[PDB]
Amino acid sequence: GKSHGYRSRTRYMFQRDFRKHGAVHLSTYLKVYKVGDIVDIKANGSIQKGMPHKFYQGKTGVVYNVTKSSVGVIINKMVGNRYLEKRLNLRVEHIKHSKCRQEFLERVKANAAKRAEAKAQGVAVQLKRQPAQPRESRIVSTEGNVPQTLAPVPYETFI
Amino acid sequence: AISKNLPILKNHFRKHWQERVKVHFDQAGKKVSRRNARATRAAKIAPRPLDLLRPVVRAPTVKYNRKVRAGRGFTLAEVKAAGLTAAYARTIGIAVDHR
Amino acid sequence: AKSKNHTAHNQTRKAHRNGIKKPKTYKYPSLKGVDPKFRRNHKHALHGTAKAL
Amino acid sequence: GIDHTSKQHKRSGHRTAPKSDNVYLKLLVKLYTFLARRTDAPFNKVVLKALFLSKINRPPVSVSRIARALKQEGAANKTVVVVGTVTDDARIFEFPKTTVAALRFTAGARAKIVKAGGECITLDQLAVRAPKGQNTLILRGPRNSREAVRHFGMGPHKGKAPRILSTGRKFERARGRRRSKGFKV
Amino acid sequence: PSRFTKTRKHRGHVSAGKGRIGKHRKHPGGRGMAGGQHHHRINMDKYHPGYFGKVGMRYFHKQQAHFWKPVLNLDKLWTLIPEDKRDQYLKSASKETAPVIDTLAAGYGKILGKGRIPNVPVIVKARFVSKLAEEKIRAAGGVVELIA
RNA sequence: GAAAUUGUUGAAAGGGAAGGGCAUUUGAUCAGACA
RNA sequence: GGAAUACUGCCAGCUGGGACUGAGGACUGCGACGUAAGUCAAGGAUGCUGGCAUAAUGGUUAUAUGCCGCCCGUCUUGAAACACGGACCAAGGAGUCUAACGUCUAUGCGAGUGUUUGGGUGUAAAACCCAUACGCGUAAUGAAAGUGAACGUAGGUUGGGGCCUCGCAAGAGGUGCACAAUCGACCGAUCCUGAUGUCUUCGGAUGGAUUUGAGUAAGAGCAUAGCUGUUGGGACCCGAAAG
RNA sequence: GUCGAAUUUGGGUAUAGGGGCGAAAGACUAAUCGAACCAUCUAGUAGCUGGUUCCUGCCGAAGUUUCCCUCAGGAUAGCAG
RNA sequence: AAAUAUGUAAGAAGUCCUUGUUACUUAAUUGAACGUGGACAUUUGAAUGAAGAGCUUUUAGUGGGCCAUUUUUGGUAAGCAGAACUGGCGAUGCGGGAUGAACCGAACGUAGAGUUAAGGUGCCGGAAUACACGCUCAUCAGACACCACAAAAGGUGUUAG
RNA sequence: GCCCUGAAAAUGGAUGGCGCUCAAGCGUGUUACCUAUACUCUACCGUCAGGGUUGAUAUGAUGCCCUGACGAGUAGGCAGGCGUGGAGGUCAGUGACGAAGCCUAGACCGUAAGGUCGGGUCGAACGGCCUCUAGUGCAGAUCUUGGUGGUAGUAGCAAAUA
RNA sequence: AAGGUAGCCAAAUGCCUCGUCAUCUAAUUAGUGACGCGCAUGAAUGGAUUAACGAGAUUCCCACUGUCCCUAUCUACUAUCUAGCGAAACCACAGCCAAGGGAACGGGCUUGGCAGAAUCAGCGGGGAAAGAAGACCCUGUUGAGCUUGACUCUAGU
RNA sequence: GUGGCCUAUCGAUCCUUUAGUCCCUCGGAAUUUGAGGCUAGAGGUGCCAGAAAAGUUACCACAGGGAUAACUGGCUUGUG
RNA sequence: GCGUUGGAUUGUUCACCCACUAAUAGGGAACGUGAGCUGGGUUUAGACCGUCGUGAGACAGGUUAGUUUUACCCUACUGAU
Ligand SMILES: [Cl-]
Ligand SMILES: [Cl-]
Ligand SMILES: [Cl-]
Ligand SMILES: [Cl-]
Ligand SMILES: [Cl-]
Ligand SMILES: [Cl-]
Ligand SMILES: [Cl-]
Ligand SMILES: [Cl-]
Ligand SMILES: [Mg+2]
Ligand SMILES: [Mg+2]
Ligand SMILES: [Mg+2]
Ligand SMILES: [Mg+2]
Ligand SMILES: [Mg+2]
Ligand SMILES: [Mg+2]
Ligand SMILES: [Mg+2]
Ligand SMILES: [Mg+2]
Ligand SMILES: [Mg+2]
Ligand SMILES: [Mg+2]
Ligand SMILES: [Mg+2]
Ligand SMILES: [Mg+2]
Ligand SMILES: [Mg+2]
Ligand SMILES: [Mg+2]
Ligand SMILES: [Mg+2]
Ligand SMILES: [Mg+2]
Ligand SMILES: [Mg+2]
Ligand SMILES: [Mg+2]
Ligand SMILES: [Mg+2]
Ligand SMILES: [Mg+2]
Ligand SMILES: [Mg+2]
Ligand SMILES: [Mg+2]
Ligand SMILES: [Mg+2]
Ligand SMILES: [Mg+2]
Ligand SMILES: [Mg+2]
Ligand SMILES: [Mg+2]
Ligand SMILES: [Mg+2]
Ligand SMILES: [Mg+2]
Ligand SMILES: [Mg+2]
Ligand SMILES: [Mg+2]
Ligand SMILES: [Mg+2]
Ligand SMILES: [Mg+2]
Ligand SMILES: [Mg+2]
Ligand SMILES: [Mg+2]
Ligand SMILES: [Mg+2]
Ligand SMILES: [Mg+2]
Ligand SMILES: [Mg+2]
Ligand SMILES: [Mg+2]
Ligand SMILES: [Mg+2]
Ligand SMILES: [Mg+2]
Ligand SMILES: [Mg+2]
Ligand SMILES: [Mg+2]
Ligand SMILES: [Mg+2]
Ligand SMILES: [Mg+2]
Ligand SMILES: [Mg+2]
Ligand SMILES: [Mg+2]
Ligand SMILES: [Mg+2]
Ligand SMILES: [Mg+2]
Ligand SMILES: [Mg+2]
Ligand SMILES: [Mg+2]
Ligand SMILES: [Mg+2]
Ligand SMILES: [Mg+2]
Ligand SMILES: [Mg+2]
Ligand SMILES: [Mg+2]
Ligand SMILES: [Mg+2]
Ligand SMILES: [Mg+2]
Ligand SMILES: [Mg+2]
């Protein structure tokens, strides 16, 4: 019959990296997680306790609870035609801080600095990002760069 | 035959209930006949009040013992204390209860 | 007689008629599953600051 | 052909007129339709829409609720407006001297307001006194205290009231409600 | 009335609203509460938890009159006094002239204390009373008399 | 004294069915305004 | 060395022929042309003229011609089917009523509500009037013995229509019902703590607990009527082999 | 085929429905027999076949999930008003 | 170690400063959580769109499906059996493929005028027996997707390389 | 590349047919032209949405009016209407000087369910509007009862000597 | 428990099988006589053999013949026509083909062939002709007859 | 450290029985046996969301099914 | 284009022999053809044997006996007005 065990189809997902087996480095256990931090989930195959289910591999959530060796993460899961909130009790070895927003905090700091320096001098602070714009006009010189003519090559075998 | 969120029903109609349906179409008719019966009885019986005198008794049970109502009849001791016999009282319009 | 066993055809189209709705977010979320010792002390911290204010 | 992003010929889903055939209620709707069109006062639009509500959407407002609202800071001399029925409440022993405008007053509610020195007026009298809702206070009754609401959303771990006829020991307290009988919800 | 039913609208539509495929048969699924544990289990486990099984202990020949005891809260206590006399007693809060309330005569068994009563002495006669209800009556200067 | 069905008389069409839709010709028949 | 032309593009350049359409019905607008009066192609057609005034136009009907058109109803992934019922016509012919209920809506009264079991009365199965009860609601929670809902402006926080103050406005401040999320308090159950006192085993004050309830926290219900839905009944109509 | 006999036949009489009768075919028991006919229970039940009667307007599907002696059926979620 | 699909973030429920509560935590007012008070407005934190957003009750029918492109399992194969994504038929007429449930175009209130789609313009049949450069002669030529079939191997037939 | 050999099936036969050979065939390029319930503009009907208008003295504020967009549909849902038997109210309604019914390739109104009129036949009752009520609408069910066809002046009306 | 004895046989009992040999014929899956490791013969579930008898099942021979080579002719009564009398089955609408596509075998649809009133006697190609809600097969939480240490009972004893 | 390094190794109602609390009830009032409740386990349903169940019909029956087999026809051509 | 046979055994299609012959080729037409026939076979109910089953009964094993209905209609065809 069919098999739908807890760790089914996880042959490669939970493997260690090549030449990266063994004990976990100490910086994993020294990081500090607080309620409200954004973390991403990546199960470590050598730690069988506090291991997330395979569905949450590669998912990002928000910490809501902090315990002795584990944290609680909030995950929104799409079930049917709606999203339901899932609460996971995961050990710290299976998570890490998310860099998707640490850079955003830098832009928040930079916006305030540019907002303040323009507060006394210039109107229209212009603190909004823009997408890539079409290129402006330019002049290309041929001094030492005379164009060289190219032609299609004939067919050859060279086997 | 169970569907949706509905209360459980207990309708007792698994017998030949349609053979024993009693509709009181004659409710108005019986009221007229009862009034006719009381009128004919009063004119026939005597100038007496058409009903016997009843005593006052305490209702039983802790739920109703706070009220008094009309009982069956006066006791033998109550009748004797009033100054007449039970045999004579029954013929004069007084209900007598011996128990 | 035999019949079809399983298919997910037309299921996504049904889900997009009224569904695919993100959850509504609330401030002051539920404290269910939070450490009981933290909640026990957090209750006393709120009582004290209410008296002060 | 047009690729439609939404349903066509869709009604607004809000009542534009009362469902009742009360001739006197229609007169009030006609009065406040005129006012809402030619006053640009937010009060008149609220009152007009409230006249379209059904019975369950207009819960009764007791006099005790009126007295509590008058205890608000700066609301002692405001006119209480209830689009519905004002009922009596004997649990309170002191009542202010306010003015109350409502569609209907019960016998107890009207007597209690008048005995305290106040007055009970209709909605058309309110319009003459306050055409733009000056110094008014709108009070609405509680909708979720209705008996039907407690059965809505029934299901596991929802904590709702089951739809049952007879309540007692032998009525839906067995397996499914306690751990000693199979499981608990 | 029959002229407002959907039967009049279904005239000339073959299936009369019951569908062509499923049809309207006699008793698909059984009669009454049939299949409550086999093919109607889901609709019974939800919407009706606790239906199957027995819980308590039996009571042979139960009489409901033994358990008659209507409850009255203190916030409704003054309603038992007629309205024409409430005003004088409220404004004449004093001893030696405390109104007497016979709760049993009004059809109640036990006095419960939920609301707040005026600070007026009242004599309350009842069969049963809760501990909190008695305290609030005495705090206003009243007394509780036990009757039977 | 209805229909199915039938007789007579009158009109019309008909080269292996008949019946129908849009448009106009031909025949028959008919209402409206003469302000 | 100097032009022309082709190709591509622009013109708030000019101008001829043909077809379809005329919606609206006092005035109001925006412009143009003029010193001005006024005029105009400027928020939708007017002017001039002829024939006929009846079967002439048109309607109806039969027929002809051009093109198109397979037999309806039904089950079905799929019917014109070599799938089933139907020769023709008239009349009859299939979701009804009842008991108990869910949602919604209308009406009366409202912490109450229900006159019609019965009584009174009558122009007599109608209409009119009425006592006491009873039903439901106003208290819940436990298997039960039982106990029984305010620390506080009937709590705090966040969002809230409307109203109030100021302001030309925008906005700011104040108050914030209903409703939504959350933290507390109160009542019952469960597990603990066990005060003053005692028929020395009774009594259970006080203070708690990732526990539990269809609760409290200025009541909302009762009655009647209607569509729709549910169950028992012959139960939308007709149909077994049987017992 | 048989034709003096285990022969053919009239009338009388006996055996009645889970019973009869059978030189035995499940044959016969009033054109009815691997359980007669008649009335009633009875409008017996049917997840199965057929049918289900006026017009216009607006919106508009599903053959997929879990459970069921569930596989021509229901409950449940979804889609629809 | 791709491509395509896939999680989160792009602010007022935010950032910054100062200091209030606690029985939790720390050697320690240390930290954690929740707050008081002050400052920062909508180029207030990318793009485009938004027949308005949010929410609740109740109930119908359905729970036999099938087809096409791409991915793909069993099978020699099948108009065979079974899955994945999307679009369709069923529930749908209309123009085209002679004819056809699914292909192409395009989806439909009643009319008038104009322009087109896919497909076509010798005649049937509305529209060039149009223009231009080549190729092909078959005693079983050929003629338009889905589609209604043809192969290996050959020819001093003819054409170009 | 094109053509040919390789290349055999049963009724007569199908580039759709005729037919077509510097094509009306094959590959490719450039223009003109034909026509869908699609697109553009206009009218009309309906639906939905956003608005204007109570002022008396002239009738519908569920009225009237302005603006924009939209229109496929089985199973199924909802809404507005048409028709039938009977009931309360009203039109002091119609009628032996002809009610009801029936016939009528005669007329008018409505998108439709239907409504109205004329003519013929006929002989005693019947209708509009506001409401109440249901044994209220048929093309089918090898439907029920009754009536009637094509088949068809057909099969046939020939054992038992006349 | 005993291992088929006396007998009998490709037998109405033998799968292989049209078994092998002999006989019968020009030619024999037939018939008969033998042979027997007999799938799976056998002794009152009776074995073997039997004169007579049989509308019983088979093979051959003689006579006989229209069974046939190979058909022909004659009689009566029909059919046929007339006078009188006068039904039924069946019927969605109907009735010419070829190919195509289509629910994969068309009277209708598409493209072609074609196509002239009204009819009589024959005829069995077609109308997937008519006669019956398939008796075969499967499905249904539909039956009945019969059987048995199926489940549960019961008269009797 | 709240069993086996991780991914499988298992079971409702009714009834019986055990453990706990020695608590609640037997409804005219009490004591002692007995019985019934409260909380947590065990006895098992493997068709494992869990009816208690042997055949035969060639004497056969009914409701249906081309959702499904025994002929043609169609697709396919391994095999021939 | 024109022909492709007569027989023994078998219900047989198939197969195998005898013989003649110029030759005794292979196939289709709803595995052509039952309102054209025939009914030997298969495939209802009777009966027998062998093997199997406790039994009722089973056997694509053998054996014997077992109802073959209707054309007058349309078209097609053959002739005839
Ligand atoms: Cl599908
Ligand atoms: Cl409707
Ligand atoms: Cl024509
Ligand atoms: Cl308790
Ligand atoms: Cl008898
Ligand atoms: Cl009409
Ligand atoms: Cl002839
Ligand atoms: Cl057997
Ligand atoms: Mg419909
Ligand atoms: Mg039907
Ligand atoms: Mg159904
Ligand atoms: Mg007559
Ligand atoms: Mg006639
Ligand atoms: Mg004309
Ligand atoms: Mg045609
Ligand atoms: Mg089929
Ligand atoms: Mg059809
Ligand atoms: Mg059928
Ligand atoms: Mg028929
Ligand atoms: Mg009728
Ligand atoms: Mg019956
Ligand atoms: Mg039985
Ligand atoms: Mg005899
Ligand atoms: Mg037999
Ligand atoms: Mg019936
Ligand atoms: Mg639509
Ligand atoms: Mg089961
Ligand atoms: Mg079916
Ligand atoms: Mg089905
Ligand atoms: Mg269907
Ligand atoms: Mg084609
Ligand atoms: Mg042309
Ligand atoms: Mg070309
Ligand atoms: Mg539509
Ligand atoms: Mg008349
Ligand atoms: Mg006529
Ligand atoms: Mg007369
Ligand atoms: Mg009827
Ligand atoms: Mg009829
Ligand atoms: Mg019909
Ligand atoms: Mg019939
Ligand atoms: Mg004849
Ligand atoms: Mg004869
Ligand atoms: Mg004779
Ligand atoms: Mg022999
Ligand atoms: Mg032998
Ligand atoms: Mg022996
Ligand atoms: Mg043909
Ligand atoms: Mg036919
Ligand atoms: Mg033709
Ligand atoms: Mg059948
Ligand atoms: Mg049958
Ligand atoms: Mg089943
Ligand atoms: Mg049985
Ligand atoms: Mg170990
Ligand atoms: Mg472990
Ligand atoms: Mg007792
Ligand atoms: Mg199961
Ligand atoms: Mg099939
Ligand atoms: Mg081969
Ligand atoms: Mg054949
Ligand atoms: Mg035959
Ligand atoms: Mg034949
Ligand atoms: Mg035979
Ligand atoms: Mg037999």
Side-chain angles (χ1 to χ4, degrees):
Chain A
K2 296 288 186 173
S3 180
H4 297 105
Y6 201 85
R7 284 182 53 171
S8 58
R9 310 169 187 174
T10 62
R11 170 168 179 173
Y12 300 101
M13 172 178 295
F14 290 164
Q15 283 183 12
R16 311 301 308 276
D17 299 328
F18 182 64
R19 292 195 286 107
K20 288 184 175 57
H21 294 259
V24 186
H25 52 74
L26 265 301
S27 57
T28 295
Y29 299 96
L30 293 182
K31 294 184 176 63
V32 182
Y33 300 93
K34 301 195 301 183
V35 171
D37 295 333
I38 299 183
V39 303
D40 60 73
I41 306 178
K42 181 190 180 65
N44 182 10
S46 63
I47 309 299
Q48 288 79 216
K49 292 181 178 298
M51 205 173 187
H53 185 261
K54 56 165 173 294
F55 170 81
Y56 304 94
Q57 173 80 358
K59 296 304 173 60
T60 304
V62 183
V63 177
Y64 80 97
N65 191 38
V66 180
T67 28
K68 180 178 65 62
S69 59
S70 303
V71 303
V73 188
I74 295 292
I75 303 290
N76 293 323
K77 182 179 184 179
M78 208 291 297
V79 181
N81 60 272
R82 73 201 181 280
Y83 282 95
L84 298 181
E85 57 164 348
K86 313 294 290 184
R87 304 205 170 189
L88 302 170
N89 299 326
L90 305 181
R91 287 185 176 266
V92 299
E93 296 107 335
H94 307 281
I95 64 162
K96 72 171 62 179
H97 281 93
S98 176
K99 294 163 56 181
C100 68
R101 198 176 168 266
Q102 177 58 226
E103 54 89 14
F104 161 73
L105 304 173
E106 310 296 337
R107 185 162 49 89
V108 174
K109 184 73 172 184
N111 291 341
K114 285 179 290 184
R115 189 184 193 92
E117 61 88 22
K119 184 63 180 179
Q121 286 77 208
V123 204
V125 290
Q126 202 268 320
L127 268 313
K128 282 190 181 183
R129 295 174 298 166
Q130 304 285 7
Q133 298 296 144
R135 298 185 296 264
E136 301 292 324
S137 60
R138 64 176 59 95
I139 305 179
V140 183
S141 177
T142 52
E143 299 294 337
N145 197 13
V146 176
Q148 300 300 135
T149 305
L150 303 177
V153 305
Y155 173 76
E156 294 172 1
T157 311
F158 53 83
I159 192 59
Chain B
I2 315 176
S3 184
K4 301 154 192 168
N5 183 18
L6 292 169
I8 307 298
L9 298 177
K10 299 189 72 174
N11 298 315
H12 291 225
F13 298 100
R14 286 164 188 80
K15 305 179 183 182
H16 288 61
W17 62 274
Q18 290 179 108
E19 301 175 356
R20 294 174 296 269
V21 180
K22 173 62 181 181
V23 187
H24 299 267
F25 288 119
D26 57 338
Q27 182 183 16
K30 281 181 170 296
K31 186 181 181 182
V32 175
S33 65
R34 284 195 301 269
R35 288 174 57 86
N36 286 335
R38 288 191 289 266
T40 56
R41 183 170 184 258
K44 188 265 302 183
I45 182 176
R48 59 171 157 164
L50 193 72
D51 65 332
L52 301 180
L53 183 71
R54 306 291 173 172
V56 183
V57 301
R58 277 288 177 182
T61 298
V62 73
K63 177 178 179 177
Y64 294 107
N65 63 342
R66 58 187 179 95
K67 295 180 178 179
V68 296
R69 57 166 174 85
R72 171 90 182 183
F74 296 85
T75 69
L76 303 180
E78 283 170 359
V79 162
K80 188 175 184 179
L84 34 75
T85 63
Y88 179 79
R90 294 192 183 277
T91 66
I92 217 61
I94 300 176
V96 178
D97 188 10
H98 61 78
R99 57 185 79 96
Chain C
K2 305 172 70 179
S3 57
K4 210 178 194 304
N5 307 276
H6 167 73
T7 186
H9 195 260
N10 197 44
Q11 297 314 301
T12 300
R13 189 189 298 262
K14 287 168 57 183
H16 280 91
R17 295 287 176 82
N18 315 281
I20 315 297
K21 302 175 297 299
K22 305 295 294 180
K24 180 183 179 181
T25 173
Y26 290 100
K27 72 186 307 297
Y28 297 149
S30 180
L31 292 181
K32 174 247 300 180
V34 189
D35 172 68
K37 188 173 67 174
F38 176 83
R39 293 196 57 180
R40 196 176 302 108
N41 180 78
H42 181 74
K43 174 184 174 180
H44 299 321
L46 268 52
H47 163 259
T49 183
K51 302 305 185 64
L53 275 65
Chain D
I2 308 169
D3 190 9
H4 295 111
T5 57
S6 57
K7 190 186 306 302
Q8 298 297 302
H9 304 125
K10 188 180 186 300
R11 292 177 297 272
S12 63
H14 310 96
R15 279 162 72 147
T16 61
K19 193 166 179 53
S20 70
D21 296 323
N22 191 334
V23 56
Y24 298 112
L25 181 62
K26 293 177 180 299
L27 297 176
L28 293 171
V29 174
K30 203 161 75 70
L31 173 63
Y32 276 90
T33 298
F34 175 78
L35 285 178
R37 177 164 52 92
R38 205 172 292 184
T39 50
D40 63 74
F43 174 84
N44 294 328
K45 296 179 177 60
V46 176
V47 177
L48 177 61
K49 291 172 55 183
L51 292 170
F52 303 157
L53 294 173
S54 65
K55 192 183 179 185
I56 64 163
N57 295 323
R58 302 167 309 180
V61 175
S62 60
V63 288
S64 65
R65 180 176 296 264
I66 298 177
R68 174 167 291 179
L70 295 164
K71 294 176 184 179
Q72 295 177 11
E73 295 76 4
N77 297 324
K78 292 190 174 183
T79 299
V80 182
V81 178
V82 176
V83 186
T85 296
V86 175
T87 56
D88 188 16
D89 199 327
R91 296 171 296 185
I92 188 174
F93 290 91
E94 188 64 30
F95 193 80
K97 197 203 173 187
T98 189
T99 296
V100 185
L103 278 179
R104 293 181 177 90
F105 294 89
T106 68
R110 182 182 297 271
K112 185 163 188 168
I113 297 173
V114 172
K115 187 175 65 177
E119 55 178 341
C120 309
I121 62 175
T122 60
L123 269 60
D124 70 308
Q125 296 182 263
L126 174 71
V128 176
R129 299 185 186 187
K132 286 173 288 187
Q134 290 88 352
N135 197 253
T136 52
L137 196 68
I138 298 179
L139 295 185
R140 292 180 288 183
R143 291 188 180 181
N144 285 19
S145 65
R146 192 166 58 101
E147 178 68 16
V149 176
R150 63 200 286 264
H151 303 282
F152 297 159
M154 184 69 178
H157 315 292
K158 300 299 298 300
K160 293 302 188 303
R163 284 169 175 163
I164 196 173
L165 257 45
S166 301
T167 300
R169 173 184 72 90
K170 299 180 299 188
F171 304 97
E172 294 189 24
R173 302 184 185 274
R175 163 199 175 275
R177 288 293 291 173
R178 65 214 302 112
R179 289 264 169 252
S180 65
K181 297 297 182 304
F183 57 92
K184 180 182 181 301
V185 189
Chain E
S2 62
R3 69 192 186 279
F4 295 148
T5 63
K6 293 299 174 179
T7 300
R8 314 310 306 175
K9 303 295 186 177
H10 287 141
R11 282 281 188 261
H13 294 262
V14 182
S15 296
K18 307 300 178 180
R20 300 180 177 270
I21 308 169
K23 301 164 165 55
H24 189 183
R25 289 287 163 84
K26 305 304 296 299
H27 288 98
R31 295 202 189 191
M33 300 291 298
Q37 288 182 327
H38 303 80
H39 54 103
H40 295 139
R41 168 173 294 204
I42 298 183
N43 194 40
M44 288 278 93
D45 285 2
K46 73 180 299 185
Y47 299 147
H48 296 292
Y51 182 80
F52 294 104
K54 58 178 66 175
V55 184
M57 54 179 178
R58 296 166 297 169
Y59 189 145
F60 301 151
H61 184 44
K62 157 78 67 57
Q63 297 186 33
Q64 303 294 342
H66 297 177
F67 304 87
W68 179 84
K69 193 189 301 182
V71 297
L72 180 64
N73 283 319
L74 287 182
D75 59 2
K76 201 184 174 182
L77 185 64
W78 274 83
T79 61
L80 273 60
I81 298 180
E83 198 278 329
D84 66 327
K85 298 183 181 179
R86 299 174 193 172
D87 302 76
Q88 57 179 8
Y89 285 119
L90 287 176
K91 277 70 182 180
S92 303
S94 66
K95 307 293 185 174
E96 289 89 25
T97 324
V100 180
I101 304 180
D102 197 330
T103 311
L104 183 60
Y108 299 101
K110 188 177 185 180
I111 297 291
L112 300 179
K114 172 186 176 184
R116 297 219 171 112
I117 58 179
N119 198 34
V120 178
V122 289
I123 302 178
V124 178
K125 301 164 58 183
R127 285 178 173 173
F128 301 92
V129 68
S130 68
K131 185 182 180 184
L132 182 61
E134 181 184 9
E135 296 173 356
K136 295 182 185 178
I137 294 179
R138 301 175 67 180
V143 79
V144 171
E145 300 184 4
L146 301 183
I147 58 178

